[PDB]
Design a protein around this nucleic acid. Structure first.
Ligand SMILES: CCOC(=O)[C@@H](C)N1C(=O)COc2ccccc21
Ligand SMILES: [Mg+2]
Ligand code: NA
Ligand code: NA
Lengths: 241, 804, 334, 49
RNA sequence: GGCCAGGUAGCUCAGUCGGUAUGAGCGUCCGCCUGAAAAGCGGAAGGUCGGCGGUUCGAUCCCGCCCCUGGCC
């Protein structure tokens, strides 16, 4: 029974491991993974996503902008510009997931972080409907919350989707419904901004935060432990693979 | 702000006009609002109170008529004779407080005590009944596409849609009788380039300055978050809340000359109604006359024409301003007023006169005024008489296809009429003209959302689409996984690195002024003003996380990270807006990409303390430079490439313990021990080592080995070679391998020896060699000939001398 | 739905062993002739109850493997006999363990689907075939280099292989002294998950090594992956911002007491303030007494909501000392 | 440049790695992986086929 | 945006409206001690008291500006 581990194992980060599990879930459904720059142009982060010119998110309040003023260059507020780039580079149909670092202005406390990671999905094909969106969301939910997981959608608003909706998740392992993310059908202005005929192709999209998903699933009290890099937060999750 | 507050009693009242007897639980109404797309923030009841909470009349401390010829006795803003609410001894106020109460103490609103207007209630009536504490206030967050829902009119219409009720529009002319139009009310001129769509005026003459608004009006203003003031101002705020058209009252006697709508001038100021001086911009809209400025168009009125406690003649204003101009103006001077918030979300231009007439008649009723039969109604040049948007064509079954639900026949046409559109049929194509209060309905997708949200998203089935024939993970994505798995299994702990560099980190590193790592991208609005620079290297974030662990008792640490860096090649340059009505060309895309700083993906690691822990086997082993070199080899094996290490000088590394890493002939990064000065100036632990490689510079490989296993025995021999101390041991191994030829199966260094037997600044290296032929057994001479060729190769390439 | 949890676990186990220096082989299902006689197994040892092939390619090797170790040991001998004397091999495959004499099932008509009862009958007529993971080691475990002469394989390297497989499976195991051929009875651990036995590890019996022509000191491990349940933990760590207290404790016990039993007793008595415990010294000097040993553990105490005093930590240490006295007879070193 | 690898990396078997690549290829298209016993009944090995 | 209240050792926090923070608990170092440890006992190291300036022979404490947390908005 003497200890024998001369080189004790490390740990991949739980957010990276969750991102890997999410990617594997969508690969198994035929989707692929795309990536893009974190410092992004305003064209792909806002303009191509049907954001109005005087939108409050384009101000200095919520978005990290690159100096000097009016540079039209910023840290991306979502991974949506990665899907715009894919829509421009790839032929149809497109089924792509984008998992990357995202930057918001919220301060760092027990339930918010300015630097977070989110997963975004984008599917554009002939005849895609809201039923296909909901089927994909439920499959995503079961893979991450268990066999008894189910989603619920309620109408909302986002500039790049119409109709738009917020997603709630029901997981029967709570320590009820929890707000998970947003979704909707790809706005036809987004398709026209990428050279796609909205009369021939329809599409859907969704987006969830990884740190948020990890917090209420595992019941992690302080999200500052997720980002500060203390060894005591990562090692309990095991080496990971 | 997207906030909208109203009491349930008022909302139920408007809905009950067309649907008599309508009444639902506040929980049911909350679920209905959520189901059709209105986010409720809070459902707060009023009070509650019980026992002795009654209304009394005042006649410091004074006697209060509690009713029935009984007088109980127990500051600031109340005189003698005002009706007040008293808390008799034994009363229980929210929550647990067991006295002239205020609106805040009764949980009804926001300084002074509550003063009921004369005639609101007889002294002695039930307090909870007069205040209406059974009511419930709904706090909603209205999305920016539904400006029509910033009012009782819009939310009541939405409920009538969701419950399939008959709806009576409170802004209609059958509900707001048309006042006479016998001539102009006031001369005005409008510059059409300012975005005004409609401007209406109607005066009210001879109102009682001592009159006060009735209690039902004041109570509804309080529950909506607006403090009552005087009848002239209370009716303008009340009609704004009721119909969604903001209204403003000007003192008619303090208007000098023709009113004018005009763009402001640079440096021009305007004293607003709050008594604060505002600096104006050239892109702002103003109402002015022959003397001063009357209002900031769509934001707030000025103190020049402000209604005061003695005003008797009121000119009422009903105008439609440009939404972009109002938003651009109110955000510059930080005035998110109730009018500005509604104008920036667009206001229904068809109800301007209807709201004006409603306002004038209500003011005269409660203040005893006289409504003048004059009216000015500017509706553009040429005058606009039809405010309907362009029609929208879409197939009758388009919402069915998008939803994936076969709705009953007529569903789409019924729902689009329910929300106010004109719907005509032409075969299988509907021509839909949205109502004037729905400028968000512009194309079929907008119409689809209306049908789907009203039918309910819960009827959309969960149907997984078929799996496309995907290609899976790319070679680069797989490699990042293998690298992460390999470092973690070797005892490294992954962190998420922050992109914002610590203040003066490169000064702590002692880098030169022209070091490329200093050429950073700056953020304009960072959370920390002294950390605006984005990271050109992952090591500062890793070393920061290393300090955190060591400072908290975890002194034996090995951390790694995989993330992009930000390395600009020019000053921050943006590209102009590309039209969104088309696809950007490949030249415009390449121009967009070229304007962005280089963002390659790096892998990096830091180590400090014990590399191997102590235990029953021994005392463990402190971190050394070779551990950083081994991390490079772990990353290399994970990437399935060969690397070479060469001595180098590159801060922040120790110049005598720093390797530059090469793949083929391309430099991919550095590794080794950190400079003792950098460690001292950074508060790092002694002996800290570090690695950073550029993954994008490492080429992906797909080797196809075809080993052939020889069944013949091997020959073992060792060779000792003396070289100058500066000769890398790998260079000797390479020279031995090139000389030995194909018989050499394995070579491994197992001895490095210095001493006087060898000579100053020289060293002896002994390698274990394994020779094997693929087709025969070797003789010792066969192996020695390959060994002798290896020795001669080493003499020629690194100056080796056979050990003697 | 992608890979199952078991298919995923098999990949992770194989990656971890390979990264730890093990070389995977493909094991043959046919047992070498008389291997169980070389091992000295009893006539009634369950591993001797084998399924036999009627027409094998080698008439002396008809039986199918109930254990992966014979195929691994045969590959180890092939490597060592050809000049590769420092080797560590592993394999993941199914074994064949019948529970009765070979019994067939008559032909089911193929014009229809077999009923669920007929399917369960066909399954019950087959021998049990669970998945195993196994490994063998000999020679140098760590090679010589400019650091020193390297380190020969020892039983602790087989125990570490168990912990590599356990960490890869995200399960906790315990190791208990056992006697079980072909292992060395003094250097053999039985491996448990909870209270269920999942295999064995350690050094092989010297007599088995002699009779089988194996390298001296050969070590081995074999675990039944089917007996290790697939886990899906969801940790919720709470990082305490308060400082820790460091103390060491030296306890004297009888030599037969396992070190893990002492650590377990120390942990049970110390309570929730104990954040970490690590053994760093085992002393059997002359001041200790015959058949006894002194063990010294490094202890890390940390409170989740306050800074501790030395007395607070010493109180938890003293309760750990009393726990060890009661459970393993430990005496505080003095 | 001195050797630093104290624990020489091993290897997964190339046949196992090929099977893994083949499995990933089909999983990426929506297929799934199933398993069965090597000692099989004649009903499922021959008669059913 | 207001007058305030906070930033102090490696960690968590006290305390002083000018010449020593005789700072605490834990963390770090040395000795007695032990085969080596720890506790215990006895010795020590370490803060430029939020930054840039102003006053003063001398400023953690008094003036001005700014950085970041909160309370109330
Ligand atoms: C993490 C919270 O952000 C979101 O969920 C929202 C704002 N969102 C994105 O950020 C980008 O992807 C989306 C796709 C469809 C609807 C909404 C989104
Ligand atoms: Mg809409
Ligand atoms: Na070295
Ligand atoms: Na020389």
């Amino acid at each position: 029974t003497l200890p024998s581990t001369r080189v004790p194992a490390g740990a991949r980060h739980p957010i990276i491991m969750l991102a890997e599990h999410v990617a594997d879930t969508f690969i198994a459904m035929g989707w692929e993974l795309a990536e893009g720059p974190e410092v992004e142009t305003e064209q792909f982060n806002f303009d191509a996503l049907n954001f109005p010119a005087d939108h409050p998110a384009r101000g200095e309040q919520d978005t990290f902008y690159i100096a000097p003023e009016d540079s039209r260059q910023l840290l991306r507020t979502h991974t949506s510009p990665v899907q715009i780039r894919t829509l421009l580079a790839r032929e149809l149909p497109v089924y792509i997931i984008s998992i990357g670092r995202t930057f918001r202005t919220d301060e760092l406390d027990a339930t918010h972080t300015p630097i977070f990671h989110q997963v975004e999905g984008l599917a554009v094909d002939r005849g895609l409907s809201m039923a296909h969106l909901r089927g994909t969301l439920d499959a995503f939910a079961r893979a991450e919350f268990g066999p008894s997981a189910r989603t619920r959608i309620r109408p909302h608003f986002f500039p790049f989707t119409e109709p738009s909706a917020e997603v709630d998740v029901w997981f029967a392992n709570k320590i009820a419904w929890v707000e998970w993310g947003g979704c909707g059908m790809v706005h036809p202005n987004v398709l026209r901004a990428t050279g796609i005929d909205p009369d021939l192709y329809s599409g859907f999209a969704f987006g969830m935060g990884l740190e948020r998903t990890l917090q209420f699933r595992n019941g992690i009290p302080d999200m500052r432990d997720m980002v500060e890099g203390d060894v005591r937060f990562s090692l309990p999750f095991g080496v990971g693979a | 702000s997207n906030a909208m507050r109203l009491p349930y009693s008022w909302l139920r009242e408007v809905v009950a006009v067309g649907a008599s007897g309508w009444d639902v639980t506040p929980g049911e109404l909350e679920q209905t609002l959520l189901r059709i797309g209105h986010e409720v923030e809070e459902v707060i009841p009023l009070g509650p109170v019980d026992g002795p909470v009654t209304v009394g009349r005042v006649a410091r401390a004074c006697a209060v008529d509690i009713g029935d010829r009984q007088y109980r006795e127990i500051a600031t803003n109340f005189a003698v004779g005002d009706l007040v609410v008293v808390a008799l001894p034994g009363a229980t106020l929210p929550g647990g407080f067991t006295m002239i109460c205020s609106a805040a103490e009764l949980n009804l609103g926001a300084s002074g005590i509550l003063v009921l207007p004369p005639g609101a209630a007889e002294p002695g009536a039930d307090g909870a009944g007069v205040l209406g504490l059974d009511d419930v206030v709904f706090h909603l967050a209205i999305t920016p596409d539904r400006g029509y829902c910033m009012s009782v009119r819009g939310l009541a219409r939405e409920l009538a849609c969701a419950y399939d009720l008959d709806f009576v529009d409170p802004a209609s002319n059958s509900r707001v009788p048309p006042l006479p139009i016998e001539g102009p009310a006031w001369p005005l001129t409008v510059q059409p380039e300012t975005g005004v769509r409609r401007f209406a005026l109607r005066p009210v003459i001879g109102i009682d300055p001592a009159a006060v608004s009735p209690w039902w009006l004041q109570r509804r203003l309080l529950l909506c978050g607006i403090r009552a003031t005087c009848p002239a101002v209370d009716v303008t705020n009340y009609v704004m809340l009721e119909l969604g058209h903001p209204m403003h009252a000007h003192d008619r006697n303090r208007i000098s000359g023709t009113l004018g709508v005009r763009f402001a001038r640079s440096g021009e100021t305007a004293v607003t109604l709050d008594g604060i001086e505002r600096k104006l911009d050239t892109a702002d809209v103003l109402i002015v006359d022959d003397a001063a400025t009357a209002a900031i168009g769509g934001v707030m009125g000025a103190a020049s024409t402000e209604v005061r406690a003695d005003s008797t003649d009121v000119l009422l204003e009903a105008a439609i301003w440009d939404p972009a101009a109002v938003s651009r103006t109110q955000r510059r001077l930080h005035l998110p007023s109730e009018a500005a918030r509604r104008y920036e979300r667009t206001v229904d231009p068809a109800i301007s006169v209807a709201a004006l007439d409603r306002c004038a008649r209500l003011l005269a009723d409660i203040a005893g005024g006289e409504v003048s039969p004059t009216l000015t109604d500017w509706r553009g040049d040429p005058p606009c008489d039809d405010w309907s948007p362009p029609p929208i064509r879409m197939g009758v079954d388009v919402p069915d296809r998008i939803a994936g639900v076969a709705y009953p026949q007529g569903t789409t046409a019924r729902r689009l009429a329910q929300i106010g559109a004109v719907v005509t049929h032409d075969g299988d194509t509907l021509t839909v003209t949205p109502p004037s209060w729905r400028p968000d309905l512009r194309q079929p997708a907008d119409l689809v959302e209306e049908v789907l949200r009203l039918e309910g998203l819960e009827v959309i089935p969960s149907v997984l689409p078929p799996a496309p024939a995907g290609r899976g993970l790319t070679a680069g994505q797989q490699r990042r996984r293998t690298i992460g798995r390999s470092l973690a299994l070797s005892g490294y702990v992954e962190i998420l690195p922050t992109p914002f560099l610590p203040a003066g980190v490169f000064d702590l590193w002692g880098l030169e002024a022209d070091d490329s790592r200093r050429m950073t991208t700056r953020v304009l609005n960072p959370l920390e003003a002294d950390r605006p620079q984005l990271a050109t290297t992952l090591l500062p974030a890793l070393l920061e996380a290393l300090v955190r662990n060591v400072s908290r008792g975890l002194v034996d640490v090995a951390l790694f990270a995989i993330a992009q860096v930000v390395q600009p090649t020019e000053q921050t340059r943006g590209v102009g807006l590309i039209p969104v009505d088309r696809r950007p060309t490949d030249d415009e895309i390449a121009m967009l990409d070229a304007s962005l700083p280089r963002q390659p993906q790096h892998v990096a690691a830091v180590l400090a303390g014990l590399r191997e822990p102590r235990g029953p086997w021994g005392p463990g082993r402190p971190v050394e430079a070779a551990d950083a070199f081994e991390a490079v080899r772990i990353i290399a094996r994970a990437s399935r490439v060969d690397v070479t290490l060469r001595p180098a000088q590159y801060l922040p590394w120790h110049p005598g313990r720093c390797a530059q890493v090469f793949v083929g002939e391309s430099s991919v990064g550095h590794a080794g021990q950190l400079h003792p000065a950098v460690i001292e100036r950074s508060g790092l632990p002694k002996g800290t080592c570090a690695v950073e490689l550029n993954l994008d510079a490492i080429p992906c490989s797909a080797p196809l080995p075809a080993p052939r296993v020889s069944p013949y025995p091997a020959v073992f021999q060792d060779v000792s070679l003396v070289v100058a101390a500066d000769i890398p041991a790998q260079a000797v191994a390479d020279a031995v391998r090139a000389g030995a030829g194909d018989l050499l199966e394995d070579i491994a260094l197992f001895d490095v020896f210095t001493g006087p037997q060898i000579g100053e600044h020289r060293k002896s290296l002994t390698f274990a060699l394994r020779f094997r032929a693929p087709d025969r057994t070797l003789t010792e001479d066969d192996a020695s000939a390959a060994r002798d060729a290896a020795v001669q190769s080493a003499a020629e390439r690194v100056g080796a001398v056979l050990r003697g």
